Structures are given as structure tokens and as C-alpha cells.
Amino acid sequence: FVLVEMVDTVRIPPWQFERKLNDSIAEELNKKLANKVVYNVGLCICLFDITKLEDAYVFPGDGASHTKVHFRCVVFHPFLDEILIGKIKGCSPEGVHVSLGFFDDILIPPESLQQPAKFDEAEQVWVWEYGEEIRFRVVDESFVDTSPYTLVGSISEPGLGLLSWW
Amino acid sequence: FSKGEKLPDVVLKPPPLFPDTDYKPVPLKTGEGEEYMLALKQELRETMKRMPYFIETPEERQDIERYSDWRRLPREMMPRNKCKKA
Amino acid sequence: QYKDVPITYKGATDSYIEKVMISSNAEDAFLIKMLLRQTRRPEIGD
Amino acid sequence: EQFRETDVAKKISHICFGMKSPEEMRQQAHIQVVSKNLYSQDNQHAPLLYGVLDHRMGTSEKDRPCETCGKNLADCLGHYGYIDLELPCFHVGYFRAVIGILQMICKTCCHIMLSQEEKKQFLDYLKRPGLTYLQKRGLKKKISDKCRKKNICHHCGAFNGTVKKCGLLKIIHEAQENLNPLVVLNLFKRIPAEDVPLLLMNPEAGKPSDLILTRLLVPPLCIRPDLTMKLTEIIFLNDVIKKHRISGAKTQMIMEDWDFLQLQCALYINSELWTRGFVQRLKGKQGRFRGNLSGKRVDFSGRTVISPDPNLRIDEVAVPVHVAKILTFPEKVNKANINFLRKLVQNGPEVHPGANFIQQRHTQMKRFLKYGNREKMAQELKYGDIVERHLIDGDVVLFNRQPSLHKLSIMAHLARVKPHRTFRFNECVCTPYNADFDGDEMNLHLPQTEEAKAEALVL
Amino acid sequence: FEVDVCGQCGLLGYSGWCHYCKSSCHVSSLRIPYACKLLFQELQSMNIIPRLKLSKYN
Amino acid sequence: TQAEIKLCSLLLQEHFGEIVEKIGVHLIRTGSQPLRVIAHDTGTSLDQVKKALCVLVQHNLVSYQVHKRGVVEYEAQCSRVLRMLRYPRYIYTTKTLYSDTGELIVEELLLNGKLTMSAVVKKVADRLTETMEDGKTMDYAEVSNTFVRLADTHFVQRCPSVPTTENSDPGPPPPAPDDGIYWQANLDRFHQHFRDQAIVSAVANRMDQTSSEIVRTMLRMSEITTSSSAPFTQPLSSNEIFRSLPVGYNISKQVLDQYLTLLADDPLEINLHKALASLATATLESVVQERFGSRCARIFRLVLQKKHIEQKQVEDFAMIPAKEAKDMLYKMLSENFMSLQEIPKTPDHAPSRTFYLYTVNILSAARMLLHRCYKSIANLIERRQFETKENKRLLEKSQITAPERQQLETLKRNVNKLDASEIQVDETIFLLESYIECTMKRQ
Amino acid sequence: KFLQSKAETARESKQNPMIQRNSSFASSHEVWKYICELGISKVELSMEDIETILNTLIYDGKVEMTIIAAKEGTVGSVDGHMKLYRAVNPIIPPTGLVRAPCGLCPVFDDCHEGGEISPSNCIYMTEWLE
Amino acid sequence: FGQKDSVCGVSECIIMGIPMNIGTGLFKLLHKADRDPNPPKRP
DNA sequence: TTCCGAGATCAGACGAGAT
DNA sequence: GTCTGATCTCGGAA
Ligand code: SF4
Numbered sequence A: 001f002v003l004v005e006m007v008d009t010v011r012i013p014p015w016q017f018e019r020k021l022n023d024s025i026a027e028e029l030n031k032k033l034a035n036k037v038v039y040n041v042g043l044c045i046c047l048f049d050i051t052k053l054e055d056a057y058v059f060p061g062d063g064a065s066h067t068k069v070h071f072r073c074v075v076f077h078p079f080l081d082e083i084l085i086g087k088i089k090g091c092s093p094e095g096v097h098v099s100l101g102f103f104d105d106i107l108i109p110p111e112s113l114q115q116p117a118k119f120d121e122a123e124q125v126w127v128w129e130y131g132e133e134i135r136f137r138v139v140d141e142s143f144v145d146t147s148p149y150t151l152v153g154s155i156s157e158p159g160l161g162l163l164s165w166w
Numbered sequence B: 001f002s003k004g005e006k007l008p009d010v011v012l013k014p015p016p017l018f019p020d021t022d023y024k025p026v027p028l029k030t031g032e033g034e035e036y037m038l039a040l041k042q043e044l045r046e047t048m049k050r051m052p053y054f055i056e057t058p059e060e061r062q063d064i065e066r067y068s069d070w071r072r073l074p075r076e077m078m079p080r081n082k083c084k085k086a
Numbered sequence C: 001q002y003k004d005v006p007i008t009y010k011g012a013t014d015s016y017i018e019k020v021m022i023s024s025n026a027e028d029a030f031l032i033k034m035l036l037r038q039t040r041r042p043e044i045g046d
Numbered sequence D: 001e002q003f004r005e006t007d008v009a010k011k012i013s014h015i016c017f018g019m020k021s022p023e024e025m026r027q028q029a030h031i032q033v034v035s036k037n038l039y040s041q042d043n044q045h046a047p048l049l050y051g052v053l054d055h056r057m058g059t060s061e062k063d064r065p066c067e068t069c070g071k072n073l074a075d076c077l078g079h080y081g082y083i084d085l086e087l088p089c090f091h092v093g094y095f096r097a098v099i100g101i102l103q104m105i106c107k108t109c110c111h112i113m114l115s116q117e118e119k120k121q122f123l124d125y126l127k128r129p130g131l132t133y134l135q136k137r138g139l140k141k142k143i144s145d146k147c148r149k150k151n152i153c154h155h156c157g158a159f160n161g162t163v164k165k166c167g168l169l170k171i172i173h174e175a176q177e178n179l180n181p182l183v184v185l186n187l188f189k190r191i192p193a194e195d196v197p198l199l200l201m202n203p204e205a206g207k208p209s210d211l212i213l214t215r216l217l218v219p220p221l222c223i224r225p226d227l228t229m230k231l232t233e234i235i236f237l238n239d240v241i242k243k244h245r246i247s248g249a250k251t252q253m254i255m256e257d258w259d260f261l262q263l264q265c266a267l268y269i270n271s272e273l274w275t276r277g278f279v280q281r282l283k284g285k286q287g288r289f290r291g292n293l294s295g296k297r298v299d300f301s302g303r304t305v306i307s308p309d310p311n312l313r314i315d316e317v318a319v320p321v322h323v324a325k326i327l328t329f330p331e332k333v334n335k336a337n338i339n340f341l342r343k344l345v346q347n348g349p350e351v352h353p354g355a356n357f358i359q360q361r362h363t364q365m366k367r368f369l370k371y372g373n374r375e376k377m378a379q380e381l382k383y384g385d386i387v388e389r390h391l392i393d394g395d396v397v398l399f400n401r402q403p404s405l406h407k408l409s410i411m412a413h414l415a416r417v418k419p420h421r422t423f424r425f426n427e428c429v430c431t432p433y434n435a436d437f438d439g440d441e442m443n444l445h446l447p448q449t450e451e452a453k454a455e456a457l458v459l
Numbered sequence E: 001f002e003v004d005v006c007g008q009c010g011l012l013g014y015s016g017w018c019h020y021c022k023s024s025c026h027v028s029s030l031r032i033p034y035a036c037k038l039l040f041q042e043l044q045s046m047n048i049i050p051r052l053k054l055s056k057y058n
Numbered sequence F: 001t002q003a004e005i006k007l008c009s010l011l012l013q014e015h016f017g018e019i020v021e022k023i024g025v026h027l028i029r030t031g032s033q034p035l036r037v038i039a040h041d042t043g044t045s046l047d048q049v050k051k052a053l054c055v056l057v058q059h060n061l062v063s064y065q066v067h068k069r070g071v072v073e074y075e076a077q078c079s080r081v082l083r084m085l086r087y088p089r090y091i092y093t094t095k096t097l098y099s100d101t102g103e104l105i106v107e108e109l110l111l112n113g114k115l116t117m118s119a120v121v122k123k124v125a126d127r128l129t130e131t132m133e134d135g136k137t138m139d140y141a142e143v144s145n146t147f148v149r150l151a152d153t154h155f156v157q158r159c160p161s162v163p164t165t166e167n168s169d170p171g172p173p174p175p176a177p178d179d180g181i182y183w184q185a186n187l188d189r190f191h192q193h194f195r196d197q198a199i200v201s202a203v204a205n206r207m208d209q210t211s212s213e214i215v216r217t218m219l220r221m222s223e224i225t226t227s228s229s230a231p232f233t234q235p236l237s238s239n240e241i242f243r244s245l246p247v248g249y250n251i252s253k254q255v256l257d258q259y260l261t262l263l264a265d266d267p268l269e270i271n272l273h274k275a276l277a278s279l280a281t282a283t284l285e286s287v288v289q290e291r292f293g294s295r296c297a298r299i300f301r302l303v304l305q306k307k308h309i310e311q312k313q314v315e316d317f318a319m320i321p322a323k324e325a326k327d328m329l330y331k332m333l334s335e336n337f338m339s340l341q342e343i344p345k346t347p348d349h350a351p352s353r354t355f356y357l358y359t360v361n362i363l364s365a366a367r368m369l370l371h372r373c374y375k376s377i378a379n380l381i382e383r384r385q386f387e388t389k390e391n392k393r394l395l396e397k398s399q400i401t402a403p404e405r406q407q408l409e410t411l412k413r414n415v416n417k418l419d420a421s422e423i424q425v426d427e428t429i430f431l432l433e434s435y436i437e438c439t440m441k442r443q
Numbered sequence G: 001k002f003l004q005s006k007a008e009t010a011r012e013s014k015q016n017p018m019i020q021r022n023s024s025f026a027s028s029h030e031v032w033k034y035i036c037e038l039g040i041s042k043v044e045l046s047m048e049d050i051e052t053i054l055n056t057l058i059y060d061g062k063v064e065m066t067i068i069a070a071k072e073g074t075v076g077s078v079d080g081h082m083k084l085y086r087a088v089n090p091i092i093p094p095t096g097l098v099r100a101p102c103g104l105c106p107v108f109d110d111c112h113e114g115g116e117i118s119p120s121n122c123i124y125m126t127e128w129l130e
Numbered sequence H: 001f002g003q004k005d006s007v008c009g010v011s012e013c014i015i016m017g018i019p020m021n022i023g024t025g026l027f028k029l030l031h032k033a034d035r036d037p038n039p040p041k042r043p
Numbered sequence I: 001t002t003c004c005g006a007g008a009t010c011a012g013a014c015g016a017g018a019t
Numbered sequence J: 001g002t003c004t005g006a007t008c009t010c011g012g013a014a
């Protein structure tokens, strides 16, 4: 997890002029940047605070109010030094699929580095033996638009020993 | 209509072509030096480095590079064998 | 193979047919000519 | 899973007028137009094949969609095609600048004939923090002053002369040298990028090598549904220049159809150096500037004969019923006109205080309120959505008497729906319009947005 | 009318992405009269190229 | 000359870096520009511009001089930057004319730009001893012997006196005892010496073996007494020709005297003006021979015979049919070799005139082919720029399946076919550029 | 008058004594033949079935003035009416060669970057690299 | 010339369809709703 | 000696709108 | 079918 300072031009429609701005911008910005990975940034989640909100213009068209909003939002972005704890929501013969608990089932570990009893043989064998720990290793995101996924990870499992569970 | 069929051609093939890799024998000498200095000009002091990579990296941590007989005798001769101008 | 091109009367108000003539032109091709009455009492604007 | 995507429109900051080099003309176009001098219409059911109307280019009719989009004629833009001219030819738009550059650059080394001081004197002028069009076009005089006095360069020492503009679109340089556009292309290739800003061509917009045409963008089909006929006349001549080279003919005719292609490329731009060109679509009181960008035709606007009515206040125009049932104002539904618009949408487009279109809250097509149940549309009417109610009394229309001579010829008026087909106003306000009632007509526009309604009423 | 141009190399690119520099990322819609769009597209037909440089609404 | 600037963007990108190219290539595009103005227009921070100009003044690509404002305007000479392309060829002729020691002398002089004697002899005492036998150490005294031996034939000239302006800083340019004085290489002497190989190969492959050697010994004894701006060599007598002959020859004086008046009277004509003027047309003729066959090359030599006599004789003087000939003229016209119809004197009429006559102009066909050869090496390097970044996975595996290795030997066949072909078009540049410099006054 | 003729059949026949060149030794001046070339032109060349057995110097010299443009000897003393010095010498090529595959293509000259004819993927260098 | 014109006046803002800055488009309008640059949270 | 004044020829334009 | 500034050619002079 990491804070990301962001700047957005948030448009409040004119039937919300009863509510306070810093709340009613926050209700919009959650609908703008939740469950959405930003390229080279990470998976945005929610709104931390609005650090600076500047003055509400109203443009010659819409009649709405457009406030340029500086804020900070918490995002999900592993730092290439994190030993996370997830769950195996799937097993493919090329590599296991781990999922952080109801977070994102999009972390796909390749499996080449654990102890020399390694295969997934399509009958859902986890590992040939001697919560699940994970080492997130690389950042890898692909911008989708191409014509008229997207944070995938590669996840390792070294000689941790795993004293509690094998 | 006589040409209204398709892009003239994907490519136009010239019936005569290039001769060879002309001057074949002796440019083995220059040709290795083409690749020799390019091995040494890139690995030189007279180059620049991507310090924009390090300002891009907020993941700085310890244990990574991001964190970390001439046998001769004295003499002195200064010659003006060269020009005395400019 | 027949697409009908119906000759409709646009107008704004209604019009009564008075005569309908049927003839051949020079290159004999069945010309048909209508004639639309309309009476207007002179109201505001005329 | 979802990755963030932004969906926001923007506005114009500036326009940087430039050219495209003929390598940029090719990779801004979707098809080659090497095809026939015929119109691509085939013998049976006249379809289009490769031609000059490929349909990946654009769309001329509602039934045929274009090919490089899926969209039809309605909401598809144009797409570009390009033709390859065999022999390069002068662009008649930039032709005065080609003589303007060939008078400045050397005709042997393609450097500008100046010292290293005068060059540095003028380049000191060009890096001024304040630069105007006046401070540019003033220099192009002065740099062409000092360069059309010299005869020997400083950079090659060869001898130059005058560039005299012989005849129609031809160049003579002092049995004197003639600069056809074949030799001009590589001379403009050898101008250094040092000397590109000294001819005042901002090289971010375009270098001098593309003042002459070796490729040519054909306009999209959606902006020509007679200029197509000038395009196929090129590709006919682009084969006649292609056939006679491999056929064997004396150069006084291969230099003639090159001349004939030079005019035909120039005739497609300007036609008064019969069929109008790209100049004549931007000219006079008929072109796009003076008549389609400024003086453009306008929806929600009517025109009748005027007759007096002293029994109105000076601020009111009597609007006929039949006009007021046609001209509509989109009044959005806003908790105060909900019962009023419900009351009038039951009337529909036959009783006058009524409506004839409803958009739903989300761009649903206007629902022509004639066929369906109006009471089912009345009860289902919610907040937010648009009703195009009739021109009712208390609405703001604005007059105009068509020879507008001063500010007072357009004036707003409140609108009261009377019973006749004349625009009736109070006769005190007739000397601003300069309007007598001897059969004079005057127009009535109806502003649609609520911001343009207040700008009529107050101002 | 409603038209789509791109930020860099600013030129009329159809729908979601601009054909010159296929990279699809900078393309941002404008709002313009159609007669002005027909001006740009017949200016660009001859060699005058109006290269729009957009800016967001401030 | 935009394709020239295409190469200077390519040549600095492969050698030093990218911002030293960018600040470099911008300076070629906007010229005499101060330090703050360069950093504002390229969008580069001022600390990196001071470093990038520091490397550029070291390798003598950017020259600085202030005139009036008291603010130094840097300026990059364009034609020096393309001489990096000839760099391994500059190494090789110091191996044919000097030993492996002096060949390494011009190498690290070309590599590190400005060098003092106290450094460059100290460096080759490292490189030549580490490749020779330990205990059989190469003595540095022979290096100092061959170091001056290069300078007496004037292959290495010294740097012009430094301006030492206040804006310029002395400490940054040297890379870290005695100070000494710096020099670059005299690559201008090479352009004589590369021309010396050019004329001696022009005679030997045309006239006879014994004709070329007396041209060589004429030019070998006229080296210091001329310069590159000499319109022709210094005049010599035939008696010192017999003195300056090599010891391999045994020819009597009077028979070579007959060959001396034979060699003086040719269509070729030592006239250094006519020598590069005749060698450039053979470079033109070897391009139409490369491209349009011997039939179109036959009419290409015909217009070099008669200046303005064309299309009423070219169907007759080569006997090839009118259909086959006239496509060769218009292909020589459309590719700008045939130049144009500069004789039409009837007024403003393409149809009715005094009949347009073709005429080759030797320099317009020269400057185009030089611009073409500048364009050519752009397509060479960019391919070798292309094939490099993919195959990096298997270069370090040696440091591997059967298609994995097979991609490498098809890469190394390709790169060595590209890099050898950068030099074979490079010899066309100098052979034509020296012709360009020979017809350019006031430069 | 003889437009129905292929002098490209006769260009080798006026070439092959100038390729062999017995006595390339430099014992003397080697002032070389043009009259014997007119002599071999009149009576008999290398064998060929020829309709124009009539021998005029005005119809036979023209094959030379093509072959000078095919790199063969210049004229020395043709100012004489029939017989003078007439020096000649077959010119061997004064250079090597100078081109490459990319020097051959006219249409491929257009490109300037990765575009529709970009040199990062051209067919011609792909053909040349095998 | 590489003429970069800004879009000002009225003969260009009418062509481009921008609200002209002469007259009613000179100033611009704000909204007076409840807002403040607030304090953040302690992290 | 060159340069600037004064002789010729050349441009784009010549209101709204309406049926 | 002129009214127009611009831009080209001649010519007499310090
Ligand atoms: S490679 Fe690039 S340059 Fe060489 S031919 Fe193909 S396109 Fe022309």
C-alpha cells in the first residue's frame, strides 16, 4: 500500500448543491477511482483525504460546478519487497494462482523456484510435498486501449522454510 | 482502368542489383574495430547515465546496486612539431 | 423492380383539383397535368 | 480487473498552421488512390471498388457505410486517401514562397546568401521573446532585401542571379537556366536546418521541401458528395505521364503533359489562375468563411409578414398560433414546471399549450408525441428529462429585420401567442427596425438554452 | 458537431483513436461546429494543416 | 541537409549517449546558442547541459566563441560529426603506414578527444604490454620515438590556443604530475592521405603498375609543402623523381621519362583539381552501373562527352532503340542525374520551343548522391539498431535451444554484414566530399 | 538506313582483340592500334553472318563511338583523312564499385522513419541479408 | 510561416464555437457552495 | 561607379436577405 | 469594368 497524490477536475452536477463540496466530491471520486488500476501507479481503492480543494468554477455550458481537486488516495502497489499472505483460488499446470483475500484474484505466480518437488499435474496438486505466503516480485501492467490482465504480478516462493505449514 | 487494380506493387524489383559486399578482404580489419570501439565507447567515462531511472525509483533499499603493471620510466619532452596558429 | 415515386401535394392548406389533363409530349411519354384551386379570403397580412 | 480510463472533452488553445511533408501525407491516409480515372462506378448497380471513392475514404449516401469505420453517413468523419504524383509539381498555394526562397538560397549549395554577421543579426531578432505576425513578415522583406543584392555567396562562392517567374508557374534563373519542380525538390532538400528559420519557416510546422507536391492528399468523400472530377483528371494524367515514359515520345510532349499536370494540380486548388476548386470553396459570399462559418443558417426560426398591433406592450410580439406550435423550447423538468409540463403534454402537438417532443433523461430519441399515449408519457415524466413545449406566452423570442444596419435591428421580445399568421408588434418599436408595414417581413429566432434566454432578455 | 482530435501531432482522428501515430492514448474529443470541422478537413486536403493544440477547460 | 542531421543523431546515439546527442543535435539545428538558451529549448536541466557540452568540447564537436554580448555562444561544426563514421578507417591506414604502436596512438587520440603526450604514451604502455608477454615488457621509449614520427609527417596537429573566457571553466574538461599541452588528431592530413590512396588506385587500375608508383612518390614528397586547399600539388622536376623512386624499382630514367610524358598527357590529367573531378564521375558512373544496367550507363557516359547535344543524337550515338532509350533518359531525369533542359529559348511554351537538350551537371548529381549516401547510412544503422534489443536474452547465456542459437548466428551474420557495409558506402562519401570541397571557394 | 540491325551482336566482335592483349610487357612505348582495328573491320572480324559486306568507314566507325561509352579507347589523330597517328588504348575500370542494395531502390527511398516503407522492416535488406 | 495563432477576438471564437471573451464572456463565474481546504488525516 | 524616384502592370473586391 | 497597393523595370545623378 502507498499513498498517491492525484489531481482531478471533479464535476458536481447542480442537483447536489445542498451537500458540502468536500463530501460530495468524495462521493464522486470514489465512483471515479475504485477497483481501477492506474498504469504505472497501482490499484486505486478509495479516498484518503482531500488535501487541497480549490474554487468551484461554473462553465459557460453545463451549469454544473467544476472544482479542480488535489487529493491523496490509497492505492495497492507492492514494493518488490513484500511477503504477502493470500489464498490459492486456482491451480494451473504452468503455475499456481494465489489470490489475496477478496482483494484481487489477478496475482498469478509462476512456479520454478521452490524445492525440487515442483509440478502442478492438472488434478489440482498444489506442490509435491517435501493461508499461503507469497513474494510479489515484478511490476507488470498493460495499457488496454489499442484500436477503434492489466496488473498481473509475478509471484515467487523461495526457501522460506514455512515452519508452521511445511 | 488500366492501372485501377491495386497498389501498383508491394515492392518494385530492379532487374540489376548491388554488386557484392565490395572490398571483401581488407575490411575484416576495420570491421572488427567498428565493433571494438563500440564495445569501448559505450563502456567509457565519456557517456551519460539514466539518472531519470533513479528519480523514477521510489523503491530504493539496501543490498541492491541502486543503493551501492604500467612499467615505465620518467622523461619530459614537449615538442612543437605542430602548428603555431589560432 | 418497381420503386414507386408518388407525386404528393405538399402545400400547407387544402386544394381542390379542378382539371387533370392527359397527353403525350413531343417524345410521346404520357404527360399528366393537375390544376389545384384554392380560394383565400384576404385576411391579416394580405 | 478494470483499468482506469478517462472520458473527458477539451477545448482549443491555439492553432499551429503548418504543412505535411509527403512522407507524412502517406501515413495520414488510409488508402492509395492509384486507381482508375473512372469514377469507380461499375456498369451494374454502380458500386465502388478502388477508384477515387473507395468508401474507406468516406461516405456519400445514407445506405452505404464507410469501410474503415462501421459508421454510416451520420456520425462518421472523413478519412483520408493519398495519390502519388509521378513527377513532382508546384503547389500553387505556396508558389510565391518558392520564388521567395529561391531568391534567398543559393542555387548551387542551398545556403542562404548572407555573412555570418547578418545571419547572426537576423537570428538575434528571431529569438525575441515577443514575436508577432508583423514582426515576422517584416523580416521576410528585409532578409529578401539583403539577399537580392548579392551575387556571390560566402559559403560556396558560386554565382547567383535573379529568379524571374517566367510565364505560368515556371521559373527562370539567369540561354538561361529554368528551374522545373524536379530540380527544386533536391535544392530544398539541401537547405540546412540552420537556415530553415531564416526563411521564417518555423520548422516544427514544416520544412521547405514540402512546398512542392510529390504526394497529394485527396479530400475525404464526406466533404464531396465536381472536385472529384478534378481528382480523376489527375490520375488520368498520372498514367499518361506513366505510359509515355515507357512508350517512347519526344520530350516536348512529356514536358507538356508534365506542364498539363502542373496546371491540373493547380487547377484543383484555384480555378482563376468550368469547375470551382478548393480556393473557391473558401472565398466570396458563398464560401465557408463568409457564409458558412459566420453567417450560418439557423434552426428554430421563422419568418412572416408583419402587421401592426398597438394593443401590446412595447416589449411583446404577437406570434401566430401555427408558428408557435412549431417553434419549440426545450424546457427541462425542475420541480416547478412538473405539473405545468404534465398539464401541457396531455395536449400534445395539436392544442396550442402543448408539446411535441420528449427526450428521456438519457439521450433517448425525442419521442414524437403524436402517435403514442400522451397520458402514459405524462405520468411517466420524471425529473431531469427534456420537454420541447410550444412557444408559449412569456417566452423570449428575438426579432431581426434583414437589412440589419445598427445594433437595434435584433431586439428581444417577450412572446404572446395570438390568433393570426402575422408577426404583430407595437408600432413604437418600428423605427429601430426601420420597418414599415408595407409588406415587409422580419425573422424571429428562438433561443434554446436557458443561458441564451437571459442574454436576450437582459441585454 | 462532435469531433475527436489527439493531443500530440494534433489532427482529426476518427472515433476512439487517431490513425497518424496509432498509439490511441492522446485522443481527446473536442466540441466544434461542423462547418469548422469541414474547414479543417478541406484545409488539410490542400497542404495547409491546422494542427490544433488542445487544452483542458480551466 | 536534413539527412545529414539524421546521421548526427544516429552517430552520437551509438557512441556516447542520448542527451549528449539531443543537446548535440539541437545545437546543429539552432546554431550559435548560449548555455541557458539551450537548456530552455531542449527542456534539459542545466546540470546535464554543462556535462553534455563538456563531453562535446572534449571530442571537438562543439566550438565556443563570444563576440559582442559577453555571453559565449557555443557552435557545433556539422561536418566533423560525420567523421566519426570514418573512425576505424582512420585506424587502419596508421597500421599500413606505421606499426601497431602508432596505430594505437591515433586510436586513443580519436577516442578520448584531447590528449597530452604525457597521458597517451602512458595509456599505450598499458594496452600493448598487457597483450605482449609478461616479463617481455614493451619499452615505452619506442612509443615516444614513433609518437614524434607521426608528427614529422604531420598526422597529428595541436589544439588551437584556448580562449579561456570567464564563462568557460578550465577544471571540468580534463578527466581525473605534469600539465603539458593537448592535441587532437590531424584528420585533415588523412584526407590528403586517403586521397593519396585514391589517385594511386585510380592510375594503377587504369594505366599500369609503374605509372602509379611515380604518382605515389610524387605525392609522398609533396605532403608538408601543400595543404588540402592547394588547387594542385607543388611542381616538381623529373630529376628528383629518379631520386625519390623506391628501391623495388629498376627502371631506367629515359623509359620512365617516356612514361612521365605519357602520364602527363591523358584525358585524366599532378592536377589535383582534375583528379577529383575525374574520380567523381566514375563514382557517378559506378552508381548507374549499380542501378540501371550497362545500357543506361552507356548513355550516361554520352552526356559527359557532349555538353548540350541531346535527343537528336542519343538515339543514334548509342544505337539502342528509341523506346528503350527514352525510358533511360526519363529515369535519369526523374532521379535527378540527367539534370535538365537548360537550352529552351522559345518563350513560355512547352510544346513550341528550340528543342530541350539534356545535360548532366556534375555537382547537382554530386550533392544529391552525397545526400543519398547520408540517407543510406541512416537505413544501415537503424536496422542494426533494430536487431539488437530483441536478442539480448541469449548473449548472456554464453556469458540454449537450437532455434535460440540459430537466431544468434543469423544475427551475427547480419550485423557483420551491416557494419562492413557502413564502410563501403563511407568511401563514396570522401571520394565525393573531397570533390565537393575542391569546388567550394571561400571555405 | 539499317534500323533492322543489332549492333549489340557486333559490340563483342569489336571488343575481344582488346581483352587478350598479347605482350602486356613494357619493353617499349606500346602505342596501340586503331588502324589494325580498322583493318580487322574491313576484311574480316570474328565470324558472323553479315548482310552488309560492303565496307565503308562511315558505317563501321560508329560501333567504336558506342564502345567508348562502354569504356574503350579514345581518338588520337582522326583529324587525318585516312592514315595518321590514331593512338588508342582499352581502358580497364579505374575504380572498383561503390554501391549497396539500398542504392538500387527508387520507391524505397521514401521512408524517413518507421512508416509504410520503414527500413526497420524492408524487404530489400531482408533479401540482401541471405 | 509557422503561424501559431491563439484563438481570441470574436472572428475566431465564433468560427471555433468558443464563447467569445468580449462582453458576457469577459469574466467568469464561481459557485458559492460549502467548501474549505480541509485538514488531512494523520498517517 | 550604385540607388532611389518614376515610369507599367497586376491584384482581389464590388451590401443584407428572401420567393 | 474600374479601384486598388505591390512589384517590377528604367534613368539621371554625387
Ligand atoms: S531499407 Fe529503408 S532505405 Fe534501404 S531501401 Fe528499404 S527502405 Fe529504402
Ligand SMILES: [Mg+2]
Binding pocket: D435, D436, D437, D438, D439, D440
Ligand atoms: Mg417597407
Ligand SMILES: [Zn+2]
Binding pocket: D066, D067, D068, D069, D070, D071, D076, D077, D079, E014
Ligand atoms: Zn469511418
Ligand SMILES: [Zn+2]
Binding pocket: D106, D108, D109, D152, D153, D156, D157, D158, D159, D160
Ligand atoms: Zn554561390
Ligand SMILES: [Zn+2]
Binding pocket: E006, E008, E009, E010, E011, E013, E018, E019, E020, E021
Ligand atoms: Zn495522432
